[PDB]
Symmetry: D2
Amino acid sequence: IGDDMKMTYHMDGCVNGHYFTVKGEGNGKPYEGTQTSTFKVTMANGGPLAFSFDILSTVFNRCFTAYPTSMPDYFKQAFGMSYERTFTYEDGGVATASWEISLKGNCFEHKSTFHGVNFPADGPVMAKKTTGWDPSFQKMTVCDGILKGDVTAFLMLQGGGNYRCQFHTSYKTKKPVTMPPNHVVEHRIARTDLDKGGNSVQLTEHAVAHIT
Amino acid sequence: IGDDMKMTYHMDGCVNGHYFTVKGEGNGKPYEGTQTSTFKVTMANGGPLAFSFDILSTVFNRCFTAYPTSMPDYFKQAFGMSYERTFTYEDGGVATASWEISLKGNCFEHKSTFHGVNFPADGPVMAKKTTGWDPSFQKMTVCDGILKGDVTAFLMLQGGGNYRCQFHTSYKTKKPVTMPPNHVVEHRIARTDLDKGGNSVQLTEHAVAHIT
Amino acid sequence: IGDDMKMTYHMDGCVNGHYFTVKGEGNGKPYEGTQTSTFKVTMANGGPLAFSFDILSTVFNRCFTAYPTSMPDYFKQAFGMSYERTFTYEDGGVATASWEISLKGNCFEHKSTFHGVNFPADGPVMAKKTTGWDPSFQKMTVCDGILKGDVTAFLMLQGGGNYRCQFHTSYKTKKPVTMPPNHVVEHRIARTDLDKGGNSVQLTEHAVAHIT
Amino acid sequence: IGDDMKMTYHMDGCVNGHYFTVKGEGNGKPYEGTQTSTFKVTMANGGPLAFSFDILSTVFNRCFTAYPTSMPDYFKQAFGMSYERTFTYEDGGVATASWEISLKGNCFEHKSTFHGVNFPADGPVMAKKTTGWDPSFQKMTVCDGILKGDVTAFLMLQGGGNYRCQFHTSYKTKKPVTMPPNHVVEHRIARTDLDKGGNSVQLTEHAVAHIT
């Protein structure tokens, strides 16, 4: 893992029956726990993003996490890895997502699949009324050989309110690595739309692990 | 809708990171609420079915339901239709699925996408320890113009026990139809493996609507 | 168990911080699966019922169930019994309840405790906007020696809509009885307010078990 | 609020049908976010604690939280307050709890009610196989005038594993106070049994609020 890394993404998604794909590129600093990427969403039925990109943001790599130089870094040791995330929204919307991260040189290849259903036709997701995720604290624990991550996330809404989403993630390594103690990952994710429709968008994440 | 109908199916799925596809054909009696179909699962990485087919069975059409000749048949009136189902398993496994049913002559075309994550590596699903679904009672209610279906299903296990799964489904019609009163759909689904691996399998469903 | 039985009830409850008690009397026909009772709610802080009585109705006896004269009647064989119910409302309200039923002659003594929290100050419960429960189908299954009951219930609302509540119940017998096959209990519960405030209210239930 | 405060507690509880009460006393430093208390559990049916005290620990006051001298302290401003907590355990156990905190001089009076059901007869709770809560990060957000707290907590188990519990709390002030920004409360709770049965036990909590 180098001080500076490159990224590439490809996503195959479906939300409320809407087929779509995503392409992206970015640059990040694994040791600093920072990264920035630019994405382009392509609706199968050519058109503007049909839902809040925020449902996708967290899917688009724990290698980009600042870990104390003592604590086992489950991610760094892996370098690939498989990710599986369950998103349970407070209004009945549910999304499942799984992805794989591979490394070629200084390039991280991220390939994912996303599938969301039961999102209210008029909720924050479908109506694109979200602004981004509130800073969160992801609790990392070990469960039967695999690293689990849990977080009661909050999607901020245009207007001021928030929309609750419970995240449950399984982090799987292709091979055995030294397991970490239970810990927490502090995150900051920011979304910046590059176009009105939100088809072109930029994402930045800042993450730091804390010994608890 | 004829007394006798033909069916064809195509599924694009992913479970715990495993890509797969499904093809099937069947015949059914819409008015009688009966149907029988034969499927063939093809694991992307050529091989035996990697998980319990029972997670897929309910995905593979409410037109095959016996409704009293008085009660509005939300399904029959539609004839296409979009389906969205959330499967929440008691052991953390979660699957989302969405499909579309179209009608050509006496042929029902069923195209679906399935995505499951967080299934315990050693649970009933991954270990293929299920036998089939226990007869259920699906509560149908109207919610903001759409027909909803809810059921606390039970997957029977080899050995005797059961594995709980809450089903939440949205039934959407391409156009407006006369809404039903809240009601219940009584179901019986039976799975019959045609080969050891369970790649080739047969399914039969019997469904009857009840005025409550 | 006689063809005609008498009932008496006493409840100690708390909802959103509101202490209250309940007293009731009724008569029922165990073999017919019918029963009618009259209750009187007393708010600790003297006053009108502070929330929908419907949250309490299902707490106020499976002995009042019509079972086929062949099928093991887990309830009848018991005659006492302990009940434990978890109520998970769709709007975040949660209620836990446990009760005991004892039998003296032709009199059923029902003693219960109810505790509800997180009900939206302005939801259907607190605002008393419910009308009653929609007819339901309670799925009965055996789980580790005890009879479990699950139901995705629907509280009907003034105006027309419905409010979802998942019921999860454990039925415990003081001693060993012949276990039933998984089955379903069809219910009809009706509430009739005897006074404006709803402090005095009448309840009637009709239940029939079905071999599935 | 003084630099040093005194506490007294009284709890009325029920778990899996077991009636019990609790009495306690402690001393704490509100500004430092520290506190220590000693409790004595009395089982209605005289005997050793029938379940893990850890289910009760978090019930036994956000005034004991270190807040930056700039950030609105929703708790301190209140000084009484009402608390409502929903505990959803991963194995089906559910507990609801509500309490009130009043202040007399340098004495905090804490009166609570606890009610738990559906805990597996042989799970970590009933079998008293827990050691304590893993350090957590409670996300505090505002929801319709009230402060909400959410946390995906982890009860550590004898042996090494953990048992998951989602905490959902409503914090209500008797009167209007300046609302905080969404934030996080970092906690450390430690339990020390003073007797074999765990009837006599000591608790210590350390809490610090973080501007996010």
